[PDB]
Amino acid sequence: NFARKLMTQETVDAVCELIPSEERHEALRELMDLYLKMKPVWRSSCPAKECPESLCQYSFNSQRFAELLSTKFKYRYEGKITNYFHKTLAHVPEIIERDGSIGAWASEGNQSGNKLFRRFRKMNARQSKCYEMEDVLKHHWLYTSKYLQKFMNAHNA
């Protein structure tokens, strides 16, 4: 939520009042602008059909972003460059043409299971360190079966 909230154009508008130079203004404007222009490809669940105009932009829209990262910002991205930038720069369209989407095949689906694991440990337990995960696994499976959630989504006339 913090990650989504921090990325606004208006945040660039807010930091522009704390920096003097016009050069830095237009540089940061282009930076966040290109990042938001290139976001939704790897973000969605079906970008090959849902937002497919920004699909074919991505090579061009990444190359200019990389180049103005080089020239305008060689103070920092001359030696070390972090690897996630290399991943989001040079390997997205090969993967997309290989494998359809990206944001489907994510680790989002499990990492939110912390609340389910914690609550199941708290409220449905027997505290014997051998069953104490057995019933957790049983309830966790019994949650995520679809035959039951069909009953829970009944209010959908």
Binding site: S45, S59, S62, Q63, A66, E67, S70, Y77, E78, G79, K80, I81, N83, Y84, H86, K87, L89, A90, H91, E94, R98, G103, A104, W105, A106, S107, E108, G109, N110, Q111, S112, G113, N114, L116, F117, R119, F120, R121, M123, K129, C130, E132, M133, E134, L137, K138, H139, H140, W141, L142, Y143, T144, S145, K146, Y147, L148, Q149, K150, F151, M152
Partner: protein
Amino acid sequence: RQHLLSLTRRAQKHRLRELKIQVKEFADKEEGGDVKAVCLTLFLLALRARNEHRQADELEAIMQGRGSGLQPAVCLAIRVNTFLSCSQYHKMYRTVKAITGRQIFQPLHALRNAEKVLLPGYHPFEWQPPLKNVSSRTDVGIIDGLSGLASSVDEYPVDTIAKRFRYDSALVSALMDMEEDILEGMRSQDLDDYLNGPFTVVVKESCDGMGDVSEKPAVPEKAVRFSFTVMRITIEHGSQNVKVFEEPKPNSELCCKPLCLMLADESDHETLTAILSPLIAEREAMKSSELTLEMGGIPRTFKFIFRGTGYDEKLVREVEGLEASGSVYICTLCDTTRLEASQNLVFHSITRSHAENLQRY
């Protein structure tokens, strides 16, 4: 004599006993030995002749059909999707039955005997061609995750608890737990329900420790969950294949099914290997077979393709065979120095298989 409803427990019985037995034995001598069905139908007729069709219609609904009260699957679903413990559920049950006279919730033994159809390990199936190193019994639920790793004071000390299914057991249980969806897909895509062509299933895996889940000088513990989810089901029909099953939300929380979980680390490499290696053994085993089981009427067949993807970045740097994160070779797909990415930015390709890393090792 006063009224049948003012009469006590066997007062009405011994009052109209002779009439009762004479018409009952006349009926079961008349209509081939059943009195309940014919008596209920004539009671419906005798009530509904008196312009009271409402009670007759709801009675015809609830007998030979649904209506008031709940199926056991309903009450199980609403027990689990509110995370209520058993005892409070029992109290809710007993006070509802005490207030309304009816029986809408189900009792707890009736709950478990409808539960056992929904775990892994219930339904028969046949692996063909069969699987080496795999016990062929189809009555497998919870076993211990250690695979009976002998653990005494002379061997390596272990400290972890892990419970798991087997892979095929949870896989067929997840397959039978979406019969409605696959039959809906086959109905909607102008196919025939009587088709047992070799479906292809594509399945996503995932594994990310969930450390610091401890509960009480504070010493912590960690835990690792290994999990999967059916993602896309298709069938090669004629000269093309066609999807019977996609997903609305792939990375949902309520559609990520567990497979194994352990009270260990993501960095304690020994225990992690010794637990997860049966699972990777079975995973390698069922990549060259067909699966056969009864799916609502006709039995059908299956194949598989796996894509272990949902590992984060640190784990896939730790199990596939790379070094730690702060290396010089950074891309887990290409092979370039960190220093190289500063000069050339975007011109590589994916060039890292699995067996290539085996031969490089």
